[PDB]
Amino acid sequence: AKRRVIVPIHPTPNYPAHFIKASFTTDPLKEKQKARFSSGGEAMREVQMIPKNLEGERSRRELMSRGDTEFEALVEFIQGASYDQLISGRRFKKVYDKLSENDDTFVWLCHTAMSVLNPGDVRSRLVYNHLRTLAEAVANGEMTLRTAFRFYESAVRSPAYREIAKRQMEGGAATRLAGISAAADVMRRMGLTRRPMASYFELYQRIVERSEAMTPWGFPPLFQFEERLSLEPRLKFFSRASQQALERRRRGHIMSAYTTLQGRRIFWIPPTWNRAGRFLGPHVTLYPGMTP
Amino acid sequence: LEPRTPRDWLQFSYRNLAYAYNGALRACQSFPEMLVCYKEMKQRGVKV
Amino acid sequence: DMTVHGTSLPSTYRMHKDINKAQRNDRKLSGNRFRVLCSSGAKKPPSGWEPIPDA
Amino acid sequence: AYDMRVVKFSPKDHRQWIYCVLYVGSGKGIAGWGRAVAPSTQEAKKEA
Amino acid sequence: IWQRRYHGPERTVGDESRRFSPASLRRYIDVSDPFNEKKSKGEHFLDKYEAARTSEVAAGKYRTTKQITEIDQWTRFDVSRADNFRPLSISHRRDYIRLGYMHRYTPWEWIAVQEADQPLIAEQIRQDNIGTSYFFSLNRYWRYKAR
Amino acid sequence: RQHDSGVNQYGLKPVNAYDFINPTNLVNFGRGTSF
Amino acid sequence: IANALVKLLPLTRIPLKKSGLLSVDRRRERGQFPGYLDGKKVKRKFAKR
Amino acid sequence: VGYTPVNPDTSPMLAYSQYHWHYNLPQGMERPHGVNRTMTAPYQSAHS
Amino acid sequence: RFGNINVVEKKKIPLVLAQMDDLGIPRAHLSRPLMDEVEDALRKFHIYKSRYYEWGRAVKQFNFIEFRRRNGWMYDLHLMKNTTKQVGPLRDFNQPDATQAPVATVEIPAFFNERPAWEQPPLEETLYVTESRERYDDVRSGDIYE
Amino acid sequence: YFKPFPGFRDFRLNRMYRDVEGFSLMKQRPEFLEWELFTRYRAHHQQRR
Amino acid sequence: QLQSRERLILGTHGAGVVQHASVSQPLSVNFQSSVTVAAPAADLFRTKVHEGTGTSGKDPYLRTLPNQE
Amino acid sequence: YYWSRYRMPTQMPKFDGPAPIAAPQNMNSTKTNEFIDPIDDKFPLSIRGPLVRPDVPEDQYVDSWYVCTSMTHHLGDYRPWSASAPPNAYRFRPYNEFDAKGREYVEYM
Amino acid sequence: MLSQNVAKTTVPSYYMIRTNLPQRKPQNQWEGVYYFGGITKRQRHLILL
Amino acid sequence: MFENYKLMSRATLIADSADSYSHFYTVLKDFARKVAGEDSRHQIGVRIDEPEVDAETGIAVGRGCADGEKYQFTALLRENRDHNGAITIMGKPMALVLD
RNA sequence: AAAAGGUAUUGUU
RNA sequence: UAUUAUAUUUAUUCAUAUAAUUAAUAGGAUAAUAUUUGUAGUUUUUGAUACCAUGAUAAGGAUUAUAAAUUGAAAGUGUUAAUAUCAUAAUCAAAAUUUAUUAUUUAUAUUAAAUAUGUAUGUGUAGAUAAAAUAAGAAAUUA
C-alpha cells in the first residue's frame, strides 16, 4: 500500500500532552479533516451557562457589587461605538441574553393567563398562591415549564368546580383580565425583574402580539413548552424573536464563495499565509475613492 | 453631534445646522423655550 | 563543535543514518553492505582483531 | 462501564464518542444513574 | 526673544500661577460644555421672556458635569506605561518583563555599557594637519596600496 | 433555565438506548444540519 | 475644476454635488498580472484532455 | 524541520515567536551585554 | 549590575591623543606609569581598521571562549551560558480565569524579577547551594530542570 | 488639563510659580474677587513687561 | 520659575513629591497594616552612598541628589 | 540545551470546553469558514457599519507580517483621530486653511 | 571535570529532523565581538619590574 | 445612545439608577423618541463648506483624479475681473493641449 | 431555495 | 412575483536541457617576543543514490451585494522531516524537438556587436474548439 507509518509524538517540555494529543493524532485516518473548537476561560462559561457556585462573603462581594447587569451589558455594547472599539454582535448578544434572561417565567405566565380556560378566581389568594409558588419555581429552575403548567391547571381550587363554572360561564372561557393582572402582580411581587415596568410590558406585549395569530390561543402540547424537540425561537409562542421574524436575501457573485474573506468581514480567527492564498486583509482597499 | 472622525465631517456644516435648528423651532410650540433653543442656535456658531 | 561541546558532531542527516543503523541493527541484521573509503584495513585487519561470527 | 461509539458529524468526519454509564449513589437513600455520550472520557463522565 | 525660561517651547510668556483647591481631587467639570462657553456674561434683552426654573426639572449641565477622575481611566497601558525620556536606570523596575514593561528609550546606564564594551576605530577621528601627499601617498607600499 | 432541554452542549440529549448506541442521530439529520 | 470652484465659491458646491462633478469614479484597470495574456483580463487558453 | 535546519538569525517566525522577541513589542535593547570587559583574554596569537 | 560604567570615560583617551598629535605635544613625552594605563586603554578601546577587518574571526571568538573556559567563567558568555531557569510572572488575583500565555522571551539576568531578600532564605551563596539540574527519570508534565 | 486638548502648559502640575511672590493682598486663601484682581494685575504686570 | 527651588528642586531629596518623615508603624487598615513596624535606624551603622535608613527627609530611603557638582 | 529557552512558566490551556456559540462545527454540508467571527460578521451592516478596525488615524496600524490582519504598533493603546490634528482642527487639517494641495501651492506662490 | 561545559545539544534525536527547533544559538545583537586586550601574569610582572 | 451615556456622570448614574428605568431612558432617550416618533427630524440636505482660497494669490487649488494613479491633476482656478476668458492646461493654451 | 432509498458502516472503485 | 440583465464581442497553424569522486579547525604590523617561520597517529563501515526510501504551500467562477468593500478557495500541484541495501550520472559556456495544457511580428522603406530561426502568398477559408460583463461605454425567458 506504500503503507504510511506515523510514530506517536510523545510529550515534551515544549509540546505538552494535551496539544500533542488533540492537535496531533498518530492514526492518519483523520488527517486533513477540519478545524475543531473548544472553549476555555470565559468562552466555556459563556456557552455552558454554568452559574458561579456561590459562597459567603467573597461570592457575595462579587455578587453584590454587581449592580444593574442589564444596564452594564448595555454600556458594554454601546461602548463599541467609541473610537478604540467596534460595535460587536457578541456584545449585542450578551445584551440580548441579559435582557431575555427571564424568558421562561414570561412565556409561562403568558401561557397561564391566556391558554387556561376558566382558571378559577386567580385574584383569589388561593389560586394566586398556586400561581406565585409555581412561577417562583419556574424561575429558579426547580420546575419545568410543562410540569409547572400542569401543576397550575391541576392545583386544587373549589369543590363542584364544573358546577360553579356552568353558572358563571356560557362557553366556559372566562375573562382574562383577572388572569393578566394576577400574573403582572406575580412578577412584580416576586422580583423577577430589576426594573419593574418590564415585567408588565413583556407580559402585555407578548399577549398583544399573539392576539394576531390564527388559533391565537391554542398550543400543541408538545411544542407548547419545553420538551425534546422544539420550535426555532422565531417560531416560539410568547417569545421575543417571533416579531423578529424575517429572512435573508442573497445575490452571490460569479465568484462569491471564493471571496469568503475579501469583504469588510470581522475576523475572530485571522488568516495567515499558510491558508491564505492571496488574501490581503479586511482593511485594504484596492479601488480607493478620493475624499477629504 | 459633533464630528469625531473625518466621516462625520462630511455630513457637517453650520449652515446645514440652520435647517435643523429650524426643524427644532418650527416643531417647538412655546416662545419661553423657543427662547432657549434660539439661545443655543446663536451660541453654537450656527450660520443664521 | 570542539569549542562549545567537546566532540565534532555529525550532520543531523548523518546522525539520522547512524540512529537508524543503531536500531535496524538492533532488531535485525544481515542487510548491510561494507562500502568504505579505504579497504586495506578491513580486507587486512591488524595483527589481532578476529571478528565475531554472529547468530 | 465506559465504551466507545463512532459519531459521524459528516460522511467524511467521524469522532470517537465515548459512552459512559455510571451510577451516583449514596446508600443513605438516594441514588441515580446516568449514561452519556460525549467525545472524551472526562466529558462523557461529567455528562453522565 | 526675551526668553523667560531656558526650556519650554514658548519661553516668552510667564508662568501664570493658578488657584489652589483644598478639594484637590474634588473638582467638577461639565462636559457638554467643558470650556464654559454656555454662560451669560451679560444680561440680555431676551432675558425677559424666560420661563422660570419651573419644569426645568433636570438642568442638563448639572447632570453632565463630572468629577475630574472620571474622564480618563488608568488602564493597564497606564500601569505598564513607558517613559518619555531616557531613564538614568531601571534597576528598580521589578515590573520589567514579567509584568509587561519595555522602556521607550534605552537607559543611560546600558548605553554606557554598550559604548564601553567595545573599542573605537582609529579611522573615526580624521585628524589632519599636513595636507594631501601629492606624490608618495598614492604610490605608497604595494601592500598598503590604494587599490 | 438558560437553554432548551432537548439539546446538550454536545448535540441532542440522548434519551433512550437507540440514541446512546447510535449517536450519529444526535448530531446529523441531513445535508442541512446546524447546531 | 469642480473642487476648485467649490473652494472659491462654496454655495456652488450644491449644484456641483448634485451634478456629481465632485464624484470620484472608484475605478481602475485590472492590475498587471502575468496570468493574463494581455495582463488585464484574458486567462490563457484552457484545454481539456 | 529538515536536515538543512532552520536558521535562528534570519527567520522571522523564530525571531518573533513567544520564545524570542516579536516586532510589535518595542524591540528595545533587553540587557546590555558587557562581555569583553568582565575579563578580557590576553593577546595570544597563533602566528608569532 | 551590568558593569562598572565610567570605564567608558576611558574612550576619549585616544581622541585625547589625536588632539595631542595635533597640538604638538609628543605622547612619548609623558610619564611611563601614566602611559601604562594609556597603553592599556589603547588596547582596550582602540583598534586599527586592519585589526577590525579580522578581529571578528571565528577562532578569535573561540579563543576568547576557551580562555574564559579555562579561567572558569562562562556566565557572561553568549554560547557557553545555559540559563535553564526561566522566570515566571506575577499571577493576578483580579483575573484568575485567563490561561495566561506569552508574547515574548528574554534571557534577562536573574536580579530583575527575583524573590526578594526576605522572601528567599538567608544567604544562599554559602549555606544552601542551589542547583537546577535535570532529572534522569522521565518527566512528561513538570519541568526538565528541577 | 481636564478639557479638550490642554495646551502644553497644562500638563505641568500646580507648582507655586513665583508670580505669587509679591501679592500682599491675598494671604493664604484669596477671598472673593481677590483672585480675579490678582489675575487682572498679572495682566497689568504683563502689559508692564 | 519654581518657588524656593534652592530648597525644593535642588536640596529637598525627594523632589518635593515624596514624604519621608514617617514610620513603618502598623495601622489597622488592610493597607497600612501590611507594613511592619521597623526597629529604628541602627545607631552606629555605616550605610551606603545611595541608601539611607529613612528617619528624616535629609536621610531618606534612597538619596536623590547626586554627589556630582 | 539550546532547546531550553523554548520552555515555559504556566500550565497549559486545557481542552476542557465545548465549541463556543455558533462556532462552525462541521455538520454534513456546511461550507465552513473557520476564520470569520460567527456573530460579529452576520450582525447586519445597517447597524455595525463597514468598520473592520477602529476609525483612527491609519498610521496607528501596522500591517502584520504573515497574518492577513492589521495590528497597532502600540499594543492596542489608541489615540483618536483628534490626537492627530491641532485642537478643533477643521477636518483634522494641519492648518485649518487649505487641504493637501491647497497648502503646497499657497506655499509655492 | 568542568561544570559549565554542560550539554547545549540534546541527545542526538529525531526531534532535530522532525521539529523546527534551532540547532544553534541565535546570534545576539547587543553583544560585542570578542577581542583580546589583556596582559598575562608574566607580562604584568615585566611592566612592574 | 453611546453619547447620551457619556454625557452622564457618576452622580447622575447613581441617582437615575434608583428608579431602575430612568437610566435606560437616559441612554436610549433618542431611541425612545425614535421608535415612538414616526418622523425623521434628519434629512440633512447637502454639506455646504467655507471658501478656502489663497488669500494673497486669488487662486483656488482643487484636486482631481482619474484611474487614481495615471491621471492626477489640480486646478489653480483664479478670479478674473477683466472678462478675458482663458483656460490653461500644463502651462499651455487649452485648445492646443486638448487637441 | 423546500419531499425522499442502501445488503455500506469513511460506506458504489 | 419582488431585493432587476449573458447573446454579444473579441480568438485558434505553437518547439527547445549537459562531458562522474559532496567527509575537518587551523588567528600575521602600528599588540611587552611560541618558527605553533611550514599545528603530518592511513586504512571498521553502508540510505536521499542511475534505486524503494510516508507526511507539508497550486489550477480550477455559477447565488452571503452595495455601501465608507477586492471578480480568486485547503483538500495540494515535482524537488521538503523516521521503509533502505543495483550501479558516482548535475550547468564553469556553445549543447540532440514528441513534449497536450501555446496568443506570431500581415506588403512604402527587412542583418552593426556575447550569434540569434529559410519558410506555410492564396475567397479570414473543415470539424470542434478559446476568452471576457473589473476604465471603459453591452441590456431582459430565476433555480
Explain the overall architecture.
Chain N: This is Ribosomal protein S9. This is part of a larger assembly, with 14 protein chains of eleven kinds. Chain C is mainly α. Chain C contains two helices and no strands. Chain C has helices at residues 12-24, 40-43. The relative contact order of chain C is 0.08. Chain G has helices at residues 2-8, 13-19. With 48 residues, chain H is low in regular secondary structure. In chain H, 10% of the residues lie in helices and 0% in strands. Chain H is flat and about 45 Å long. Chain I has helices at residues 12-23, 32-44, 49-52, 58-70, and one strand at residues 46-47. Chain I starts with 11 loop residues before the first helix and ends in a 76-residue tail after the last helix. The chains are: A mainly alpha (292), B mainly alpha (48), C mainly alpha (55), D mainly beta (48), E little secondary structure (147), F little secondary structure (35), G mainly alpha (49), H little secondary structure (48), I mainly alpha (146), K little secondary structure (69), L little secondary structure (109). Chain A binds chain M through residues 7, 12, 14, and chain M through 14-15, 21. Strand 3 (120-121) of chain E pairs parallel with strand 1 (46-47) of chain I, so a sheet runs across the interface. Chain A binds two RNA strands through residues 2-7, 28-29, 31-32, 248-265, 273-275, 277-280, 282, 284-287, 289, 291.
Record keyword descriptors for this entry.
part of a larger assembly, 14 chains, F: two-stranded antiparallel sheet, 11% strand, I: 146 residues, mainly alpha, 1% strand, elongated, RNA-binding, LysM domain-containing protein (chain L), Ribosomal protein S9 (chain G), ribosome
Instruction: Give the beta-strand count of chain G.
Output: 0
Determine the strand fraction of chain G and express it as a percent band: under 5%
Elements of chain G, N to C (H/E): HH
Helical coverage of chain F, percent range: 10-25%
Total strands of chain F: the figure is 2
N-to-C order of helices and strands of chain F: EEH
Sheet with the most strands of chain F? Answer: 2 strands, antiparallel
PDB class: ribosome
Keywords: Ribosome, Mitochondria, Kinetoplastid
Entry title: mt-SSU from Trypanosoma cruzi in complex with mt-IF-3.
Chain A: mS59
